[PDB]
Amino acid sequence: SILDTYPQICSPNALPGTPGNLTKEQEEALLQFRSILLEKNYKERLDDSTLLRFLRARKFDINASVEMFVETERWREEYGANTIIEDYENNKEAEDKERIKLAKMYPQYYHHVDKDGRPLYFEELGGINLKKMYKITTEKQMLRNLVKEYELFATYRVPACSRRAGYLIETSCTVLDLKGISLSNAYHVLSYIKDVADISQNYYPERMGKFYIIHSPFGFSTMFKMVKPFLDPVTVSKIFILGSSYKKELLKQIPIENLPVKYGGTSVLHNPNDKFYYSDIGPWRDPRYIGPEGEIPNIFGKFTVTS
Numbered sequence: 001s002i003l004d005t006y007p008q009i010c011s012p013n014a015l016p017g018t019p020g021n022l023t024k025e026q027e028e029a030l031l032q033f034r035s036i037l038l039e040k041n042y043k044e045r046l047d048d049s050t051l052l053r054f055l056r057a058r059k060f061d062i063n064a065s066v067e068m069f070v071e072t073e074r075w076r077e078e079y080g081a082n083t084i085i086e087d088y089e090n091n092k093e094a095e096d097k098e099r100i101k102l103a104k105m106y107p108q109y110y111h112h113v114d115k116d117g118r119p120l121y122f123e124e125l126g127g128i129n130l131k132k133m134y135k136i137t138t139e140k141q142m143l144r145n146l147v148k149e150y151e152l153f154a155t156y157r158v159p160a161c162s163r164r165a166g167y168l169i170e171t172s173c174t175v176l177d178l179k180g181i182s183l184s185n186a187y188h189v190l191s192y193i194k195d196v197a198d199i200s201q202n203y204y205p206e207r208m209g210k211f212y213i214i215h216s217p218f219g220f221s222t223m224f225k226m227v228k229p230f231l232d233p234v235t236v237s238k239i240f241i242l243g244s245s246y247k248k249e250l251l252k253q254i255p256i257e258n259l260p261v262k263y264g265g266t267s268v269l270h271n272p273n274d275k276f277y278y279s280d281i282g283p284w285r286d287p288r289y290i291g292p293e294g295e296i297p298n299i300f301g302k303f304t305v306t307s
């Protein structure tokens with residue numbers, strides 16, 4: 001399989017329960033877990049990395065893990081997640097046209113990696129005008145975009161970043177920029193945030209590495225109290241709402257040369273004219289780290305900036 005073309009064991013610093021560092025009990029739990037799924041006639045997504053993510057999410061409770069994995073497969077099938085990339089490719093022209101319009105309003109882009117080799121992801125929310133946004137897209141569509149990215153992450157970003165890092169990468173480093181949002185709108189989209197949380201928590205376990213929230217308005221901490229109800233404790237412990245010293249905290253986790261200038265780093269697009277909201281820069285663009293999976297498609301069509 002493709003798995004033989006990139007590291008399947010995490011770095012030596014990874015906590016037990018991860019690929020390459022299991023206790024005897026865990027390693028035994030994993031074999032039993034796979035056996036049960038194999039008996040249920042499951043074929044795909046049964047590799048160590050995937051299975052350990054579900055096991056970790058359920059603290060290695062085999063039956064709870066089986067139940068979680070079964071429901072995930074169910075959803076993947078009904079949601080169309082197993083063919084989300086293919087279907088997008090067959091509709092690229094139309095979908096790209098609408099995505100281009102949404103990107104400028106709601107920047108979503110990866111820009112290199114963090115110090116551990118994790119794909120570095122950025123989102124900027126301050127330019128969103130809900131009214132204008134609801135005229136060009138729907139929450140439904142934004143969720144499907146999210147799901148598609150989850151698939152692109154596992155398909156293209158992980159193999160490449162793992163080959164570069166020298167070890168298996170299973171998570172991302174996210175920076176949520178809230179500069180310019182109204183605490184009021186934060187409350188207003190609680191519903192969508194819940195939907196995002198449901199899909200991620202339930203179908204994409206152990207995919208969060210580091211998650212920073214910067215430039216949040218005063219009072220945000222209170223609004224966040226309403227988000228925590230639908231986030232597992234493990235997830236909440238990965239979320240960090242930074243203050244005025246955010247650049248210094250980001251510099252502790254991300255190479256200065258990989259962090260955009262406005263966030264405290266020195267990274268600049270090769271062509272200062274290009275926009276980060278049409279960019280997709282990282283190891284998965286480096287021919288040296290792209291494998292049999294091929295190169296990731298261009299989500300922003302012709303405007304896609306890969307440098």
Ligand SMILES: CCCCCCCC/C=C\CCCCCCCC(=O)O[C@H](COC(=O)CCCCCCCCCCCCCCCCC)COP(=O)(O)O[C@@H]1[C@H](O)[C@H](O)[C@@H](O)[C@H](O)[C@H]1O
Binds near residue numbers: 178202
């Ligand atoms: C309409 C625009 C709204 C965009 C507002 C959208 C904001 C969302 C922003 C970005 C999208 C998030 C992408 C997340 C990338 C990380 C990968 C990922 O999916 O991680 C997953 C995390 O799932 C999530 O919860 C994702 C949702 C994150 C919510 C972040 C809080 C949002 C902050 C709100 C800001 C306010 C918005 C301002 C509004 C202004 C707009 C005018 C898996 O977690 P992990 O710890 O890896 O494993 C879990 C496992 O899974 C559980 O089962 C187990 O029980 C548990 O023990 C663990 O094993």
